[PDB]
From a paper:
Mycobacterium tuberculosis, the etiological agent of TB, possesses a cholesterol catabolic pathway implicated in pathogenesis. This pathway includes an iron-dependent extradiol dioxygenase, HsaC, that cleaves catechols. As in the aerobic bacterial degradation of other steroids, the core 4-ringed structure is degraded via opening of ring B with concomitant aromatization of ring A. The resulting phenolic metabolite is hydroxylated, yielding a catechol, 3,4-dihydroxy-9,10-seco-nandrost-1,3,5(10)-triene-9,17-dione (DHSA). HsaC catalyzes the meta-cleavage of DHSA to produce 4,9-DSHA (4,5-9,10-diseco-3-hydroxy-5,9,17-trioxoandrosta-1(10),2-diene-4-oic acid; Figure 1). The overall fold of HsaC is that of a two-domain type I extradiol dioxygenase, with the structure most closely resembling that of BphC (rmsd of 1.16 Å for the 275 common Cα atoms). The active site is located within the central cavity of the slightly larger C-terminal domain, with the catalytically essential mononuclear Fe2+ ligated by His145, His215 and Glu266.
Crystal structures of HsaC were obtained in its substrate-free form and in complex with DHSA at resolutions of 2.0 and 2.2 Å, respectively. In crystals of HsaC soaked anaerobically with DHSA, the active site cavity of each molecule in the asymmetric unit contained additional electron density that corresponds to the steroid metabolite, DHSA. Remarkably, DHSA binds in different modes in each of the molecules, with the catecholic ring coordinating the Fe in bidentate and monodentate manners in molecules A and B, respectively. The asymmetric, bidentate binding of the catecholic moiety in molecule A corresponds to that which has been reported in other extradiol dioxygenase:substrate complexes. Briefly, the proximal hydroxyl (O4) of the catecholic ring binds the Fe in the site trans to His145 and the distal hydroxyl (O3) binds trans to His215, displacing the two water molecules in the resting state enzyme. In molecule B, the catecholic ring is bound to the iron in a monodentate manner via the 4-hydroxyl (proximal) group with an O4-Fe distance of 2.8 Å. With respect to its conformation in molecule A, the catecholic moiety of DHSA is rotated 60° clock-wise around the ligand's C6–C7 bond such that the O3 hydroxyl is 3.7 Å away from the Fe. In contrast to the different binding modes of the catecholic ring in the two molecules, the bicycloalkanone moiety of the bound DHSA occupies strikingly similar conformations in the two complexes, suggesting that this moiety is a major determinant in the binding of the substrate. More precisely, the bicycloalkanone moiety occupies a largely hydrophobic portion of the substrate-binding site, contacting Leu174, Leu190, Leu205, Val 214, and Phe294. The structure of the monodentate-bound HsaC:DHSA complex was unexpected, but potentially provides insights into the initial substrate-binding steps of extradiol dioxygenases.
Numbering used by the authors:
A (entry chain B), B (entry chain B): 1 to 298
C (entry chain A), D (entry chain A), E (entry chain A), F (entry chain A): 1 to 299
The structure:
């Protein structure tokens, strides 16, 4: 059907205490109920967790989990993966119980970022209330989007578009020097990927990161929610990556800020919806309409 | 096309007089014109009957009738049934006249609840007016939904989803003890089934009942209609199964009450509509958002 | 302009720990700052407090507070009290500071019920977030309504309608023998008054109560918020006074429960709004369309 | 404020069994409770009765009842009757109890047509459910309209517009020779009055009728409700007075039929609503856009 | 209430056959019934006539007719004319019969322009169907607007605004030397007046015209109706005065053409509507946003 | 009627080249025609100028200009100034020609702040097109708002509310010790006034400024227009006074920056609109919901 949205992200961390206070006091997410080691479960809506943090010696991406509509929809991904020759494994009894899904397959892309593709998640039904009064925009758009590293842009395009069936939604070139090529280069390509109306749920920057993550975006309903988060971040001396601005691409009004795992979170609103029957995949030539001053890091 | 909705229910009863007064004074349905033995015909809209009660020595389900769009739509069900090897029979001349349909096939599932699958019903056109002023919600959603018993959940899923072509809309686990397994069990699964936008028209609880029915739901337009029915039920000392509440699943605002056939009726409003192009089949972990206190039986 | 809405309610209480637990875990209101020791401010929205609970020896109503649009709307109420000769005091500096208003007058109706009419309240701006996810319905409808006790319904009709300017919105007759009177001769009236679109902000029953108060109604956005409350209340063993129902007059979908003060709170949604330009004052002949079984049950 | 709408109509009748059968099986109204023996209460909505039928020796109109918003709206009507010197009586205790109102004044217009102006009516709250599935259109438009007979149209214009405050909404001229007058010299006027958005609540024809009444109009929601009525009426052999049509002035889609009192009822839908702030009083020159063939036919 | 709109225009004409042909084949109006011999009634809607053309020796305006809501709205205009001492006559019986109104007063403004203020017009109810498929825009906006000639703009301002109660809606200055005055010293003003939401019903130019009239504007629903008219007019060799354009003040999309009377008709759509509660009277400094090239061309 | 909105602002300036560059390249306003040598007209819409900048020796406010609906709305303001004995002069012929208005009166409030109240302004009709693609929000809300300096807040309250008729829309208390007063005893008030739906057109701070002006606010349609401005301002090295935020009182999403006059301009969107019939004048206790960090930073 087929992948349909970003379901969860599992990350590994060296500072579980900082994650807990950043997730609860800056992001205004809600902590989920146990939660093994722990192991922090961060909640946005009726999913048992969207952001799962497990303790370890590295600050990195473990898995990205991707929701399908049903059993048939997972089978479609299986059939595609076999057609290409991508090795994949069924979740073990213990993995299904842990993620709380009916079926799941595990595999990596050629970079290899690890993927979990699943169907039949459990939901928790008590209202999830942020103490700051914002609601996240999830539903049919899913969790948010993730921008990850790739070792090779053309190879990512192949895997995500041709093998897995994402749609190419947007493309932006990088000057050859920024990816270590001679100024004489081939530019390289940052490509954005859609699986549902959310402009993108996924993108591949062909430059390295230590975590494997460039940014995670989560969306709230209103500008005020973004603005109030900015103030909570500033008050807690969270480092800023980009100033408030509006994207050209997805029309998201957002700021970026460093998380305790070293990568950025984009916290935004007003994200653009895409119909695949109308959409023309083209190249954008700027990141923002205004704002998003990425020089603010240093 | 293919099954499209719940058309009617035929039940057998030991107390025809209690049915008549419950159907007319509590449910505010209208009695249809003859009506063999009798045989009570209960009406909700322009169908000649939705709930047909025939006298006998048991309080049980006889058949569930399922409407298709047309001749081609019934043929599609025939072709599916032959593909699996399910024996089925054409209605006799006398059966077609009795149900008042153009074509119908008779068969049972592996449990075997008996099914009638038909097209080309007659309608009656005089306004059907409840003396209590409510209107039932039928139309493209059909009669309502029925929760029946199954001897085996996985076998029901097969028959209904893979053979007949219902969509899996929702799934809820039962602890192993409640179905007679050791506390060490496999949980068993209550699975909800859709054939049109009505969240579900059918569900299978894998625990026995004497009638074969767990509940029949009928929907009215407004909360007030539900509330007024509650008061009519209480006044007539109808026993309650669950208190007013809201479902997690289908978002139905409803109460359950025992009928004269021993099974419950859920009388509700505000039921959720589902688009199969968007819908993610997931597992719910609670029955209600609030209310629906099922301890009220004893 | 006139009085425009119900602003706040100040009550006295014998169990402060029970009110805090109630206010917070059943009602889902939010604690304000920084009431006197150990008074309790309970918030619904950007009012510094809508329900103020102060320690004492009775469970009783102290004052109902009534909001005016501005200084001139308050003057119009002085002028009306003067025409009648109704005594009123201007608030003291400490009272203004305490209530967080710019002006305020105090008086009592003829049954001794105490009013504070004010304008120019401070507001607090950080979002009030119920742990339970509901939002209250206030704004131009104000905090809700209050049903108080009265000694004489004809004297109250005159004070509230003719002197103060509320509009009579509905009336319901009560049997002469359950007021203490014969079985021939005049009924007693429950009268519902409004000062804004909320069908009623005020009603008066001529029947005696220990606290001064027959009920406080607070309104939430949706049926789900009412059902989730009822469920918290049942879990916390709160005594029920009336089952869920829908009223005939204001079409409120609500249930009633006993508070730590032993008066009811009505917790409801879907309240009907009234335009004075077309509204006909009539007599209702039932409490409910359906439910609201007071048998469960007090009083 | 003023009179705001038509409340009820009380008629006298020679055949009570025929009116009950009519009221119930043709009109699809609902029987109320518990009229005097063997009076008939016919209900459209939550009014205890809108058409009250009492046993007698004639088929005639007894009183038209006119609803005011509240006590002060009734006082405004006293004050207007006093300015003119129009005699009126206050209702007795038994009359108040009988009509289920809080106050009521009785008088007559100069042709002797009797009015009851009231406020504070009781309502009944259990759903009124027509066996035929239609809903009537009442609310702020009230029960409907009535076309009565008048002796002098200029005296009626003054009483109804100038003394009582209805607005003139439309006028239609009638030939001088079908009033009894020459063939040179002045026409007689049919004048349509309103007191709310319903294009008219009241009209007066200067032409004689046995009953006092030219017609009663009641309004249902949709065309289908009108067509289904017409069909019940044809099945019950009710005498038709005018075929289905659409009026020019109120754009009512309606037919006319004879009642057991021998006056017409107009049964219609799609009535036009009027805002007094922009409404121009003019003269219509036809009854209908189409249909309404009175040839079928009375009178 | 006051004058509420422009009702009708009566003009005198030297060529009756040309006006009928124009009225009917260019304007797409419909012939009314049964004007005097051989006067011409031209209809836009249910008014018996909106443009009445009578045989004579000049092409001139006879009277502008102005509609009031009712008898009391007409009295308010008498009262205003009396305060000023402006002479007016009541209409005669034959005049009432002729104009098909219930009351009417005649007077002239200080430049001698003749007004008929009326209420209680007859309407005709069979559908007025333009052979060309357009509908005119009238209703509460009335027949359209008229730009007349004035001797003194300050005297007209006083008569129309202060005595009669139109609102000043816009003003446009005219060069002192094209009024006949020096080159130092005061401009002359074109003033636009309204009595309903139509941006203007009346304007006055202090510049001389043979007919009394600078222009008549009539409004149709859509741009297509304007373009189809222009095309009939070009086919019939009607002299153009101004090409299609959009006005700055009323945002009318219109063209101007010469009539058989030699004054212009403006034929337009999309006229802007005004609410007096927020409308600011200002000065425009151009006729058009675009087009309306009067060079084509008269005058 | 009264004053209806803020019309224009006239300021004096020491650097004219800096204001032109600012006005044009940061604000995205459009240059008007043909101001005196070398005065600067800055346009937002069809007003000939909304911000008029004239060469001088200080950066100061000269006059705020206030628009009335018509001649009679201006008379109502004369009448109010007369009741108080407030001196005002009628404008001279050259002043009328210069301001492009029909009438105008000049006076000063009791702190010496100079007002020009006018009606009958000329408009210019060719589209005003910002090079940056934004549209300003003016119309019935007028040019924006201005926060001026005051010597006494109680005297200003009386002048602006009681004499001139603005409505008090909000109030915010300021610490007694940052006005120069003790630490016991009375706060000073920031008061926000409005004359139309724009939450405020005018506010007064009792704190000293070199220019007369605390800030000018101008409003654009959307958040994107604000963000694109901020970006032009950062590129042009304009000094920031307050970061982007949302106000508590008018829900304006805006940032503040220093102008070439050294007073702030607030550049914002999403301003809340007020209906006087339901608006309650209250006290706010924060500047912002979020952002608006004045630390960045002046003053
Ligand atoms: C460039 C861009 C376009 C559209 C988006 O929705 C979006 O998130 C981005 C940013 C992706 C990416 C990032 O987050 C880290 C810093 C990067 C490499 C840049 O400086 C340009 C693109 C940036
Ligand atoms: C559990 C549930 C979820 C969603 C629904 O729409 C719905 O009707 C139900 C109830 C089904 C079922 C029942 O009616 C009898 C008592 C049962 C076994 C329970 O106590 C839980 C589920 C119940
Ligand atoms: C009748 C009624 C209508 C609308 C309301 O909002 C509302 O609170 C009521 C109830 C009034 C009153 C009460 O508060 C306590 C118990 C009373 C006396 C009853 O037993 C019936 C009316 C009740
Ligand atoms: C003309 C008319 C317009 C609107 C109405 O609602 C309406 O009832 C009428 C009819 C008035 C009147 C009547 O009732 C009996 C028969 C009459 C006299 C006719 O023959 C024409 C007008 C009719
Ligand atoms: C300027 C104007 C605005 C709105 C209108 O509806 C409208 O008719 C006009 C035109 C007024 C006037 C005219 O009728 C004849 C020729 C005139 C004098 C011109 O040449 C410019 C203004 C014109
Ligand atoms: C508080 C406020 C609310 C709504 C407004 O539109 C608005 O401009 C303000 C700001 C008022 C005022 C100012 O202009 C300069 C700096 C001030 C004194 C502050 O530091 C807080 C309030 C500010
Ligand atoms: Fe992003
Ligand atoms: Fe159910
Ligand atoms: Fe209540
Ligand atoms: Fe009628
Ligand atoms: Fe014109
Ligand atoms: Fe501001």
């Amino acid at each position: 059907m087929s992948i349909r949205s970003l379901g969860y992200l599992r990350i590994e961390a060296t500072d579980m205490a900082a994650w807990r206070e950043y997730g609860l006091k800056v992001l205004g997410m809600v902590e989920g109920k146990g939660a093994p080691e722990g192991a922090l479960y961060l909640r946005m809506d009726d999913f048992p967790a969207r952001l799962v943090v497990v303790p370890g010696e590295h600050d990195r991406l473990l898995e990205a989990g991707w929701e399908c509509a049903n059993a048939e929809g997972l089978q479609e991904i299986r059939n595609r993966l076999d057609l290409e020759g991508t090795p994949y494994k069924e979740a073990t009894a213990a993995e299904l119980a842990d993620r709380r899904v009916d079926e799941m397959i595990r595999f990596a892309d050629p970079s290899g970022n690890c993927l979990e593709v699943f169907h039949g998640t459990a939901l928790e039904h008590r209202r999830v209330v942020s103490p700051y009064g914002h609601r996240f925009v999830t539903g049919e758009q899913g969790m948010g989007h993730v921008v990850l590293s790739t070792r090779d842009d053309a190879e990512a395009l192949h895997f995500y578009r041709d093998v897995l069936g994402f749609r190419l939604r947007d493309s932006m070139r990088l000057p050859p020097q920024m990816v270590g090529r001679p100024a004489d280069g081939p530019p390289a390509w940052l490509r954005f990927f859609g699986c549902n109306p959310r402009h993108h749920s996924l993108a591949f920057l062909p430059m390295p990161t230590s975590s494997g993550i460039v940014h995670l975006m989560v969306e709230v309903e209103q500008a005020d929610d973004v603005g109030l988060c900015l103030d909570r971040a500033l008050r807690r001396k969270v480092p800023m990556s980009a100033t408030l601005g509006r994207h050209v691409n997805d029309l998201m009004l957002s700021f970026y800020m460093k998380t305790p795992g070293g990568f950025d979170i984009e916290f935004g609103c007003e994200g653009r919806q895409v119909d695949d029957r109308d959409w023309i995949a083209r190249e954008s030539t700027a990141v923002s309409l205004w704002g998003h001053d990425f020089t603010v890091g240093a």
